[PDB]
Ligand binder design. Structure first.
Ligand SMILES: O=c1[nH]c2cc(Cl)ccc2o1
Length: 126
């Protein structure tokens, strides 16, 4: 049901947290080859997460579940801010701009955590 799809979406979000933290560690340590691979992995993970979030939102709409639709619209908007910041982080790595990369790393953590306080109202509304 929409809830098994939400559990999968939550798990993909958790996989992205895991890979993100390993990537941050590699960035701090100067292992640029590892960072490149983790950034490619995160891009794939964000694409999969977005696909699951869109299926959840579209299903809540087809059910006319007004509260779930509202929360999912808000959450997906914040998720997109995170993705825009992630894309800018990718570009800073490409350009050799470690100062900007550090700053985006920090920004992406805070925006991702902000989206998460909606996650538990979403699970109860679905
Ligand atoms: O659940 C998952 N984990 C995944 C990791 C990559 Cl790289 C792509 C899709 C995924 O879906």
């Amino acid at each position: 049901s929409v809830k098994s799809e939400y559990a999968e979406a939550a798990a993909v979000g958790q996989e992205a947290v895991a890979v993100f933290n390993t990537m941050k560690a590699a960035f701090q340590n100067g292992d640029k080859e590892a960072v490149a691979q983790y950034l490619a992995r995160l891009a794939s993970l964000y694409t999969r997460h977005e696909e699951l979030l869109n299926r959840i939102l579209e299903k809540a709409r087809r059910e006319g579940n007004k509260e779930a639709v509202t929360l999912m619209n808000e959450f997906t908007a914040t998720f997109q801010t995170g993705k825009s910041i992630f894309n800018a982080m990718v570009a800073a790595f490409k350009n050799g701009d470690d100062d900007s990369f550090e700053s985006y790393l920090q920004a992406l953590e805070k925006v991702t955590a902000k989206g998460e306080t909606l996650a538990d109202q979403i699970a109860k509304a679905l």
